[PDB]
Amino acid sequence: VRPWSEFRLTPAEAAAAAALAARCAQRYDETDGPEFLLDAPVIAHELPKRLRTFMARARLDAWPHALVVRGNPVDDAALGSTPVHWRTARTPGSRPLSFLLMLYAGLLGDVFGWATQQDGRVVTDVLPIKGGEHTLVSSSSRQELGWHTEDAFSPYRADYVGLLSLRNPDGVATTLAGVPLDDLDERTLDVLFQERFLIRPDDSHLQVNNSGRVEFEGIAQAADRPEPVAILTGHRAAPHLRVDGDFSAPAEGDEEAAAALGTLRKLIDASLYELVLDQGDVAFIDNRRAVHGRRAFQPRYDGRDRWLKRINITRDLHRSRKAWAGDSRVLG
Ligand SMILES: N=C(N)NCC[C@H](O)[C@H](N)C(=O)O
Numbered sequence: 001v002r003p004w005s006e007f008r009l010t011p012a013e014a015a016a017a018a019a020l021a022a023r024c025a026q027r028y029d030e031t032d033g034p035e036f037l038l039d040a041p042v043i044a045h046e047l048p049k050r051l052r053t054f055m056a057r058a059r060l061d062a063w064p065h066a067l068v069v070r071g072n073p074v075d076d077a078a079l080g081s082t083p084v085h086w087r088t089a090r091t092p093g094s095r096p097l098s099f100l101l102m103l104y105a106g107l108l109g110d111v112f113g114w115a116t117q118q119d120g121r122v123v124t125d126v127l128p129i130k131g132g133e134h135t136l137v138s139s140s141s142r143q144e145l146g147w148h149t150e151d152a153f154s155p156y157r158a159d160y161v162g163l164l165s166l167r168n169p170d171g172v173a174t175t176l177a178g179v180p181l182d183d184l185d186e187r188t189l190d191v192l193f194q195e196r197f198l199i200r201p202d203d204s205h206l207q208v209n210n211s212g213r214v215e216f217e218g219i220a221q222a223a224d225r226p227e228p229v230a231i232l233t234g235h236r237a238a239p240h241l242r243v244d245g246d247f248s249a250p251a252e253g254d255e256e257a258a259a260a261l262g263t264l265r266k267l268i269d270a271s272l273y274e275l276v277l278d279q280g281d282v283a284f285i286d287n288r289r290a291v292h293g294r295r296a297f298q299p300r301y302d303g304r305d306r307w308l309k310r311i312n313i314t315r316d317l318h319r320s321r322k323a324w325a326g327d328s329r330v331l332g
Pocket of ligand 1: 136137138139145146147148150151202203204244245246247
């Protein structure tokens with residue numbers, strides 16, 4: 001038994017999906033261009049039927065922390081070396097796989113980016129950046145990426161975070177945890193459902209981690225003057241989760257909130273588990289049910305580092321209307 005739902009492509013299905021992505025790469029100039037953003041969800045209807053059935057059903061299941069699709073071929077020679085930075089990471093070798101991720105994502109919802117993250121790209125990059133080993137962002141390595149809800153600070157955070165493993169030669173684990181419902185007593189649960197916590201945007205939204213835009217103003221407002229929010233929402237028997245293990249804090253001087261958050265931290269630490277995304281594996285993490293992170297690892301810096309493409313997905317773009325930063329697909 002596993003806490004995520006898993007699908008493995010047959011070689012023929014994987015080949016068909018790859019061919020569709022390659023065709024898109026031939027026909028559109030970029031993945032984040034207006035044209036492909038609009039067309040991808042309909043082109044995705046041509047993906048292998050068994051995969052479409054999996055995506056449609058698994059998303060409606062009550063339990064999974066992620067939807068995992070194994071078996072997409074990746075040829076390291078065609079892919080080329082791991083980029084040294086996200087800025088130069090739209091390499092020709094990675095381009096078809098970026099289209100593939102977008103097509104899969106279009107089966108689950110509306111893709112979007114952030115004006116304040118990797119230049120507002122929709123398909124973003126996860127890779128280790130030399131000098132940035134001990135940071136709190138996804139280009140870290142030697143320091144573990146602590147568990148968190150993606151963009152916890154924001155009402156407009158993704159419903160799903162998609163990850164496509166381009167290479168992962170040393171098998172570094174992604175970490176996941178759900179709400180620790182088997183261990184949270186009722187009183188603690190009660191407190192976590194109340195608006196008694198603070199966050200802050202994570203460091204990926206800092207100007208220094210981009211190559212402004214007015215949207216950085218909103219990040220500052222969120223960091224300097226966070227509004228108290230709940231950590232748990234929805235059904236008490238299956239709550240949605242909004243927390244960042246590093247940045248969450250209790251409301252000022254609220255020791256009962258603090259106790260609940262401390263207990264939560266301990267229970268999530270104790271229940272955190274590993275998912276290894278091997279080369280060609282794709283995961284869609286349910287960002288309402290689960291926190292995620294990434295284990296510490298020693299970076300290589302030899303051209304073959306671990307490298308993922310990544311994408312934020314919402315079930316409803318209109319929920320972030322307020323934050324539509326000039327365009328509906330880049331938020332802030
Ligand atoms: N490090 C913590 N706890 N949170 C922020 C990490 C996030 O995954 C951020 N969006 C990033 O990609 O680096």
